[PDB]
């Protein structure tokens, strides 16, 4: 018979975060964000039961150089600990080499974050500005 | 001052294209775009279709 | 402030184990909402609307 | 095998297998590039205030 | 002249019939060149370098 899908993820804004009153909430309703409604509509179209779960180690997933073990949601799926992972996860070859990724629903690139230096134009002193008072 | 660089564009957005009729607009007689706007539900894309 | 263009091209995709029978239909739904533009509405919700 | 600028669509997914995207596409607007417009008489009071 | 942002998010991928054994390895090479960024090099070659 049909079974509830173990959906693993990680708390990340605006993707996944707990609701402000999650303590008096239960199950999937305890969380909120983009990927929440995303996977929600995924179950809407595919017609299955699911369950929102948080990654244990709090990571995306990585392969140990020594023990060759994948951690995070990656290991969760590889070791059958989860049923599916929907998260702001980067798609890489090493990640393809162990599990399957769907077609990318969102294309991204590396970004450069700097400060916002704001120099408001003075109203009074900007008149006598150039040399000195 | 005294710079002829204007680079003025009339529409700059497909919304404004829907907001005008002077400059016509269209695509090929077929394609995934034609089915796109054929099936699109955006009032902009719907009106333009 | 975000400056400069994207240094590369990467994509967000759903992770599913190899051989999972759900990969194909779920990916089909991905193509659906992608073609349904709901992705744009929700991205505007959690990025632009707020 | 088919390697060409073929738009990935659902109905096309419905029958064959597409590879992961090597390039991302968006609808574009091609307009005839206008020339640099001359300002004309109004340049008299144009700068610094309207 | 091209104006305005992308009205949608589409993509191009190599098309292969369902059941083709070459889909997975060719797709792997796609992810390789993507990680190798060669796609940007040739895209510059035939788009911007010319």
Swiss-Prot record, chain A:
* Posttranslational mods: Palmitoylated. Depalmitoylated upon L-glutamate stimulation.
Write down the position(s) of the site called Interaction with the cone snail toxin Con-ikot-ikot.
63
Q: Where does L-glutamate bind?
A: 88, 90, 95
Q: What subcellular compartments does it reside in? A: Cell membrane; Postsynaptic cell membrane; Postsynaptic density membrane
What do we know about what induces or represses this protein's expression? Answer: Down-regulated in the pyramidal cell layer of CA1 in the hippocampus by global ischemia.
Q: Which residues are tagged as glycosylated in the record?
A: 2
Instruction: Let me know which tissues express this protein, per UniProt.
Output: Detected in forebrain. Detected in dendrites of neuronal cells. Expressed in the pyramidal cell layers of CA1 and CA3 and in the granule cell layer of the dentate gyrus.
Give any extra note attached to this record.
Answer: The postsynaptic actions of L-glutamate are mediated by a variety of receptors that are named according to their selective agonists. This receptor binds AMPA (quisqualate) > L-glutamate > kainate.
Role according to the record = Ionotropic glutamate receptor that functions as a ligand-gated cation channel, gated by L-glutamate and glutamatergic agonists such as alpha-amino-3-hydroxy-5-methyl-4-isoxazolepropionic acid (AMPA), quisqualic acid, and kainic acid. L-glutamate acts as an excitatory neurotransmitter at many synapses in the central nervous system and plays an important role in fast excitatory synaptic transmission.
Q: Which family does it belong to?
A: Belongs to the glutamate-gated ion channel (TC 1.A.10.1) family. GRIA2 subfamily.
Give the record's subunit note: Homotetramer or heterotetramer of pore-forming glutamate receptor subunits. Tetramers may be formed by the dimerization of dimers. May interact with MPP4. Forms a ternary complex with GRIP1 and CSPG4. Interacts with ATAD1 in an ATP-dependent manner. ATAD1-catalyzed ATP hydrolysis disrupts binding to ATAD1 and to GRIP1 and leads to AMPAR complex disassembly. Interacts with GRIP2. Interacts with GRIP1. Interacts with NSF via its C-terminus. Interacts with CACNG2, PICK1 and GRIP2. Interacts with GRIA1 and SYNDIG1. Part of a complex containing GRIA2, NSF and NAPA and/or NAPB.
Per the record, what about its domains? The M4 transmembrane segment mediates tetramerization and is required for cell surface expression.
Q: What is this protein called?
A: Glutamate receptor 2
Give the species.
Answer: Rattus norvegicus
Shown residues within the full chain: 412 to 544 of 883
């Amino acid at each position: 018979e049909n079974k509830t899908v173990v959906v693993t993820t990680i708390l990340e804004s605006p993707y996944v975060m707990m609701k402000k009153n999650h303590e008096m909430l239960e199950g999937n309703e305890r969380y909120e964000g983009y990927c929440v409604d995303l996977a929600a509509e995924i179950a809407k179209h595919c017609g299955f039961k699911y369950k929102l779960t948080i990654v244990g180690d709090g990571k995306y997933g990585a392969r140990d150089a020594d023990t060759k073990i994948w951690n995070g949601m990656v290991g969760e799926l590889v070791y059958g600990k989860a049923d599916i992972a929907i998260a702001p996860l980067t798609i890489t070859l090493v990640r393809e080499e162990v599990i399957d990724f769907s077609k990318p629903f969102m294309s991204l690139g590396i970004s450069i974050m700097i400060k916002k230096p704001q120099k408001s134009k003075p109203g009074v002193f900007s008149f006598l500005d150039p040399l000195a008072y | 001052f005294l710079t002829v660089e204007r680079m003025v564009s009339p529409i700059e957005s497909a919304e404004d294209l829907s907001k005008q009729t002077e400059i016509a607009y269209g695509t090929l007689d077929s394609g995934s775009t034609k089915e796109f706007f054929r099936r699109s539900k955006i009032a902009v894309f719907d009106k333009m279709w | 402030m975000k400056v400069g263009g994207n240094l590369d091209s990467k994509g967000y995709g759903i992770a599913t184990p190899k051989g999972s029978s759900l990969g194909n239909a779920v990916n089909l739904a991905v193509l659906k909402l992608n073609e349904q533009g709901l992705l744009d509405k929700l991205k505007n919700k959690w990025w632009y609307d707020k």
